[PDB]
Design a protein around this ligand. Structure first.
Ligand SMILES: *[C@](=O)([C]([C]C1=[C][C]=[C][C]=[C]1)[N]C(=O)[C]([C][C]([C])[C])[N]C(=O)O[C][C]O[C][C]O[C])C(=O)[N][C]1[C][C]1
Ligand SMILES: [Ca+2]
Ligand SMILES: [Ca+2]
Length: 322
């Protein structure tokens, strides 16, 4: 059983709050500016000034911890530089077992609610249970940071808060390494691949990792700084963590083509090249494959051929489990 971060005891705190007729407020990560940050989110910063801390039970009549499962569409980045963390959470959702280690069952805004939630992370070389109160940064009634495509769903917001907690503040999550979040969700072994020097069996390596529920992410290095724009001509985001979410082979004009699926943690802004949602390539695969694989939605998720993937992206990270 996970050891308690800082000795904070989720069930004890919950039961005592319920008995005392109050909602939990977390002394270890309180609803004040120092939990937001120190510079860009510091006490005197423009961003801090516009934020008010509110519980989901203050925002909505019917807040829900999980709605239609804890899935990758639940991860929509807000106004924070934590794409790396969010790419990792989105990948985490594809492995049911590890997902629900990190996100324990039995948490609700109804029976037994007392304004406290908990999550398990691999931290300090231990599996640790981290509590948070459910006060969340908001502006004009909406979450400022991560939110779900399902507007009344809060598990991912609360998880991002717990991860901020262990790192000291939300601002502490601005800029990072996808593999660091991968490790913090698994205790696993991380490896990376230079896509410009990809081994000839990389696609098989990817297939196998996805099969076993390993976590995969990818990115495009900015080799100049940003003097060819943050976004590429074909609508990829440079210096930005994507989750790799599938790998499947289609029959394109009678010939197998290896495809790879990825997801922008923004929940929007997608590749517009071959195999993109509106591309013509889909017209030349058999309708069953097209229907299984293609989803015409601005949801941040899209396909690329593996060929185009290894040309466009520069880095692949894989976190392998037990
Ligand atoms: C991601 O794209 C962020 C944007 C970002 C924010 C703050 C600083 C730098 C970049 N991208 C990253 O965090 C990238 C992700 C990798 C390419 C996978 N990390 C990175 O460039 O490493 C920087 C090192 O910083 C670590 C400092 O630790 C002390 C994003 O969140 N984008 C949305 C804001 C638009
Ligand atoms: Ca959901
Ligand atoms: Ca899409």
């Amino acid at each position: 059983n996970a050891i308690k971060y800082l000795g904070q005891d989720y069930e004890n705190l919950r039961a005592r709050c319920l008995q005392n007729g109050v909602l939990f407020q977390d002394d270890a990560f309180p609803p004040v500016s120092h939990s937001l940050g120190f510079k860009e989110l510091g006490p005197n910063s423009s961003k801090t000034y516009g934020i008010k801390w509110k519980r989901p039970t203050e925002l909505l009549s019917n807040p829900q911890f999980i709605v239609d499962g804890a899935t990758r569409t639940d991860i929509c980045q807000g106004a924070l530089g934590d794409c790396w963390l969010l790419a990792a959470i989105a990948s985490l959702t594809l492995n049911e077992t590890i997902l629900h280690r990190v996100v324990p069952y039995g948490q609700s805004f109804q029976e037994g609610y007392a304004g406290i939630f908990h999550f398990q992370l691999w931290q300090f070389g231990e599996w640790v249970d981290v509590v948070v109160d459910d006060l969340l940064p908001t502006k004009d009634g909406k979450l400022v940071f991560v939110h779900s495509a399902q507007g009344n769903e809060f598990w991912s917001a609360l998880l991002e808060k717990a991860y901020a907690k262990v790192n000291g503040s939300y601002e502490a999550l601005s800029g990072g390494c996808t593999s660091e979040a991968f490790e913090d969700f698994t205790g696993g072994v991380t490896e990376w691949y230079d896509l410009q020097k990809a081994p000839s069996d990389l696609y098989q390596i990817i297939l196998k990792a996805l099969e076993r529920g390993s976590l995969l992410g990818c990115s495009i290095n900015i080799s100049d700084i940003r003097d060819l724009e943050a976004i590429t001509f074909k609508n990829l985001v440079r210096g930005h963590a994507y989750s790799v979410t599938d790998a499947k082979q289609v029959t394109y004009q009678g010939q197998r083509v290896n495809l790879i699926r990825m997801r922008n943690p923004w929940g929007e802004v997608e590749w517009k090249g071959p195999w993109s949602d509106n591309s013509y390539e889909w017209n030349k695969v058999d309708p069953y494959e097209r229907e299984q694989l293609r989803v015409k939605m601005e949801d941040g998720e899209f396909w690329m051929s593996f060929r185009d993937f290894i040309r466009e992206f520069t880095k692949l990270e894989i976190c392998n489990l037990t």
